[PDB]
Scaffold this active site. Structure first.
Site, short mmCIF file in Angstrom:
data_model
loop_
_atom_site.label_atom_id
_atom_site.label_comp_id
_atom_site.label_asym_id
_atom_site.label_seq_id
_atom_site.Cartn_x
_atom_site.Cartn_y
_atom_site.Cartn_z
N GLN A 122 46.11 -80.48 2.36
CA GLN A 122 46.92 -80.16 3.54
C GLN A 122 46.31 -79.03 4.36
O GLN A 122 47.01 -78.16 4.87
CB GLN A 122 48.37 -79.82 3.15
CG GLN A 122 49.19 -81.01 2.68
CD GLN A 122 50.65 -80.65 2.45
OE1 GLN A 122 51.06 -79.51 2.67
NE2 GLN A 122 51.43 -81.63 2.01
N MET A 485 58.13 -96.21 34.76
CA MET A 485 57.11 -95.59 35.60
C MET A 485 55.80 -96.37 35.55
O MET A 485 55.10 -96.48 36.56
CB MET A 485 56.89 -94.14 35.17
CG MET A 485 56.10 -93.29 36.16
SD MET A 485 57.00 -92.92 37.68
CE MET A 485 56.19 -94.02 38.84
#
Ligand code: FAD
Ligand code: FAD
Ligand code: 6QL
Ligand code: 6QL
Ligand code: TZD
Ligand code: TZD
Ligand code: MG
Ligand code: MG
Lengths: 582, 582
Positions: A122, A485
């Site tokens: 991580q 859009m």
């Protein structure tokens, strides 16, 4: 006189120093999602009695909620994430806060110091990744530096031109014991020396001078004003100059006033862009001259003397070269010019009634218009109804798309920090989490989210956060079954060739998909769907009166187009005033 | 003999060159979410008849689906996003593909060339951000360079140690007309010169030599094998050496075999870690010696001669120093050593029955164990039931947490590319999108997603993608109402002090929240919830037999702990074998 939970001679963990460092900065709300590299910080947050943690369901929802917390109040937003995948989910939020100048402080865990650079578990180089999408970032190498770095972070994030500041803290620093020294001096020599000074009367008196010489002046108000709501309104009383606003400056000057030109730019009103096109003096306060506003820079205010006021010396002269310029706080410039106008009031004899009447002509000839088809709900009318029933006193957060522009056009915001929208980056899924942060910062306010079916589903997991934290967030979903859009540009410039812009199910094409009511039902939120224009007023009245959260699905015809529209890089003469996909 | 849709002398758009460049690389599936800066690419994708676009509901779901497409097949995964907020949503996927060495090619739109560096609309320095989380990236400065850059991208992403390669394309390049030259030579001198050569017989014969001198040998198999499934099994027949596997190497050697030590490491079996602790020869094929496997490097195989084979010369000698090392493809090393063992078969007289019996003793004394409480469903038993009913032939993708480790322990994978899990980065929400990509690459396979309530909700929006595309994705949700992996560490090292690890509703604490069945109902997916252990077998049988997608909510007691567990940085003597949160 701050009161700590620890003795001045008692060693405590680095994570406990970090939480106390936040309490000293006035923090009372954080948006933290737990992880392995930040459990010490979460353990220390429970020991604090003055800091509340709003647990989101996705770190991108946490940073977007921190933006809404900051956009709607003025305080800095604080989000906390773990290392690796927790930190990389903040990237969309950090880039947005930088582009829109939102004060933000992000704290991320990290693998211990002796493991950075080993492709650890991580582990991601979060400082090197975000160096270009933050105002500044830090990597804490010693528990001694915690009180100083936190002070520098909240200072850099809120002072000058605000922005996001990231602080990466390794796990072994959170566990190390130390005695904090809260008397540390900040190591910001070059930043504080370059800070803007209060404006000179030499500059301010030439501004007032250029106003009396002008015949057609326009105010170009942007996101830098916000804090200067009163000073701006006082400045307009004395000059009587019309006020055009950007997407970020909505509410700085009330939209219901007669002197308001509303929004200008690509999807701005015809009369606002007209005033800029045929002006001789342009007062640009708190703007950055985006191509969404200017288009072709050579035709933007081509016959106008340009006055630019900005707290960032890098922004003055970037795209458009001004005649007179002032580097500093627009709030102080207005206060200094208001004093000049009150003393020399009768000496100046300011009257622009001829210029205002010339604009009132265009304001009547080309107003914001929308069409009603049978009993279908036009989205613009739905926002006008919401404007009526809330009396324009509601905090509005939107996604990105057609519903975003209509939320700007057909709602008259009265005060700043009422309009929360990703303008610079234009990140979808910003709306719903931003409404969460605003509802936490303003508990007694009417927080209404105006999302689109595409933007809403991206961070739909945050509905669980709304129910668990019991927030009165109203969701006004304008479902058009499309990515509007993108669909609008397909109709104009690509012969209406659909290229993956339909969000419904092709098997059941005339069925609303997904059934957004069941999304709210899963999170125990009351929901309702309205389709006929007659039932619209009663449906929104039900949403507002129902205590707690509420979701209202409003079905709209997808063929609607946002108007007006100045195409990309075009001039005012290229403005499109009519058209749709039928 | 490729057949283009354009004439060799016909100019076409840059976006049309890009799509044809993908067709020449054998691409047939992309995961593209439309946006302003990439509409030209989406317009050109509709003109293609050999490329299918899977429209996701979030760009992070698109890149995670591209990983599952690549992890489950071996082909490279191709995702496409727009500029700004579209590109920054790929960051979690790019960092994951790099840490797990997954072949990936990401294409993002960008503002036109003349607008980069101006804080333009939806503009983010995507090349500078991702430079540290990709194998390589490009910024296309000319439409002429498109055929060459695409060739270099698919080459770098799949050759050597695979990884993600990003390609940023400005909008004005997609619109520019040109005639592509498909005979371009790649500009990769230094990369191809440093490429590994086939292994020398001098090295391989000393490996076989060290095996006959050894008494206690162990195979340390990792994610580099995968393609070498057959060669590895043939190598074990000739040597009879037990095989320990990492989280990434599951399936390389079948888990149902008697010579299998299953997984080793932090949450590895006691007997696998035992074999490594008391070995004299360690054959590390396709591993990177992660701290999740080794812990304290001085106690890891302390009495063992270490043989390391890796295609990346940077990985050999990074953490642990080997005696003998071989830089090259593990698939070729096994083929070369199998020939040495067949010829000199009777000369060597290989028998390790004493070492295997010593391990079979530990395999019987400390096996994988779980407890059943009344009629509650133990999660480990639910996976064992899934293993039975699918006959171990199912492609499994998981999230990150307790359910992830149990999916590794209690399922016997028979072939590689059957196990899809974020191991290096450990990104939550990876599961459900990864199942989407695997179901597209393997249409006739049994794709089952084993998520946790926290990981599942992060990318829950992808259920709409599953229904719209009509994919037979099975979701085996192990709902424990908690963030299990974080909750387990709170019980051990923080005196069970809960710090924001509960995902349900505190008002109704004994009510399952959220109601995940309604999440599937919103997307028109059949769902069911099972709570009693007796009804478990019939519930999973229903999920598999029901055509199309299916969601099964399995309620588990949250007090379960993943065992065994070697704490962080500890040795084999610090292994925890019993304990839970009761
Ligand atoms: C689909 C879509 C359509 C859009 N269309 C439009 C449109 O038609 N019209 C439009 O205007 N925008 C539009 N935008 C938004 C646009 O991209 C920008 O957000 C906007 O144009 C720029 O806002 P701004 O000028 O107020 O600058 P801001 O981003 O708000 O920056 C504020 C400026 O003032 C300065 N400043 C900050 N604080 C202070 C202070 N205390 N004192 C002095 N100065 C300060 C800052 O340095 C900065 O230069 C659209 C966005 C999207 C997603
Ligand atoms: C909660 C959690 C718990 C975990 N616990 C464990 C655990 O207990 N045990 C465990 O093992 N992991 C665990 N992990 C995963 C761990 O972080 C790493 O993913 C894993 O340890 C490393 O896998 P690997 O050794 O196979 O290397 P990989 O990441 O799979 O890399 C493959 C290696 O082989 C090389 N290689 C690639 N292709 C070839 C080729 N064709 N020929 C030759 N060489 C090649 C590569 O260069 C690389 O060095 C856990 C992860 C999480 C999220
Ligand atoms: C969320 O659940 C988990 C799971 C897990 O491994 C299964 N680890 C952690 O904590 C870490 C998070 C990030 C890095 C870590 O590595 C680490 N941390 C240390 O803290 C002092 C020490 C250490 O020495 C090897 N490694 C650790 C770690 O605790 O091992 N949390
Ligand atoms: C000024 O000249 C140009 C030219 C150009 O392409 C040649 N692009 C841009 O900026 C964009 C950057 C990113 C996306 C763009 O398309 C776009 N613009 C919108 O503005 C409202 C909206 C939108 O919907 C998704 N797409 C645009 C766009 O102006 O077309 N500017
Ligand atoms: C994360 C992301 N992806 C893509 C885009 C590009 N984009 C997309 C895909 C839009 C359509 C939004 O669809 P919607 O349903 O949410 O809203 P409307 O249909 O009412 O416009 S608008 C826009 O700028 C974006 N801004 N952000
Ligand atoms: C995006 C992200 N955030 C946080 C983490 C840290 N983390 C978190 C928060 C875990 C708990 C996962 O909860 P779950 O419900 O999905 O699975 P289990 O409860 O069965 O373990 S595991 C883990 O490594 C992470 N890995 N990824
Ligand atoms: Mg829409
Ligand atoms: Mg869980």
């Amino acid at each position: 006189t701050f009161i700590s939970r620890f003795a001045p001679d008692q060693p405590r963990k680095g994570a406990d120093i970090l939480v106390e460092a936040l309490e000293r900065q006035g923090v009372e709300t954080v948006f933290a999602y737990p992880g392995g590299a930040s459990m010490e910080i979460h353990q220390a947050l429970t020991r604090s009695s003055s800091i509340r943690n709003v647990l989101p369901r996705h770190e991108q929802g946490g940073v977007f909620a921190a933006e809404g917390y900051a956009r709607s109040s003025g305080k800095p937003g604080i989000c906390i994430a773990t290392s690796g995948p927790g930190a990389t989910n903040l990237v969309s939020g950090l880039a947005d806060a930088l582009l829109d100048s939102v004060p933000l402080v992000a704290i991320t865990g990290q693998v211990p110091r002796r493991m950075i650079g080993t492709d650890a578990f991580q582990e991601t180089p979060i400082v090197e990744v975000t160096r270009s999408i933050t105002k500044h970032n830090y990597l804490v190498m010693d528990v001694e530096d915690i009180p100083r770095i936190i002070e520098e972070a909240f200072f850099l994030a809120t002072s000058g031109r605000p922005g996001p500041v990231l602080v990466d803290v390794p796990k072994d620093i959170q566990q190390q014991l130390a005695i904090p020294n809260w008397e540390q001096a900040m190591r910001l020599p070059g930043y504080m020396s370059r800070m803007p000074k209060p404006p000179e009367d030499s500059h301010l008196e030439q501004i007032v001078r250029l106003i009396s010489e002008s015949k057609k002046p326009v105010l170009y108000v942007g996101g830098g004003c916000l804090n200067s709501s009163d000073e701006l309104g006082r400045f307009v009383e004395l000059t009587g100059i019309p006020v055009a606003s950007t997407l970020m400056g909505l509410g700085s000057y009330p939209e219901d006033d007669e002197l308001s030109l509303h929004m200008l730019g690509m999807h701005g009103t015809v009369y606002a862009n007209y005033a800029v096109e045929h002006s001789d003096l342009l007062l640009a306060f708190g703007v950055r001259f985006d191509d969404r506003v200017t288009g072709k820079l050579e035709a933007f205010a081509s016959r106008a003397k340009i006055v630019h006021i900005d707290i960032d010396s890098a922004e003055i002269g970037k795209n458009k070269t001004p005649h007179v310029s002032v580097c500093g706080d627009v709030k102080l410039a207005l206060q200094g010019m208001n004093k000049v106008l009150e003393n020399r009031a009768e000496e100046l004899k300011l009257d622009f009634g001829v210029w205002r009447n010339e604009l009132n002509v265009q304001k009547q000839k080309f107003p914001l218009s929308f069409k009603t088809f049978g009993e279908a709900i036009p989205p613009q009318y739905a926002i006008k109804v919401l404007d009526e029933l809330t009396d324009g006193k509601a905090i509005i957060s939107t996604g990105v798309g057609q519903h975003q522009m209509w939320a700007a056009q057909f709602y008259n915001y009265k005060k700043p920090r009422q309009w929360l929208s990703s303008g610079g980056l234009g990140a979808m899924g910003f709306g719903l989490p931003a409404a969460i942060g605003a509802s936490v910062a303003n508990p007694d306010a009417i927080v209404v989210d105006i999302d689109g079916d595409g933007s809403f589903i991206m961070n739909v997991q945050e509905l669980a956060t709304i129910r668990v934290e019991n927030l009165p967030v109203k969701v006004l979903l304008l479902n058009n079954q499309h990515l509007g859009m993108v669909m609008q540009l397909e109709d104009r410039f690509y012969k209406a060739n659909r290229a993956h812009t339909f969000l419904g199910d092709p098997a059941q094409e005339d069925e609303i998909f997904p059934n957004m009511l069941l999304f709210a039902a899963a999170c125990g939120i009351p929901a309702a769907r309205v389709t006929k224009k007659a039932d619209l007023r009663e449906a929104i009245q039900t949403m507002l009166d129902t205590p707690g959260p509420y979701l209202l699905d409003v079905i709209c015809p997808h063929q609607e187009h946002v108007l007006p529209m100045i195409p990309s890089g075009g001039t005012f003469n290229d403005v499109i005033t009519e058209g749709d996909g039928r």
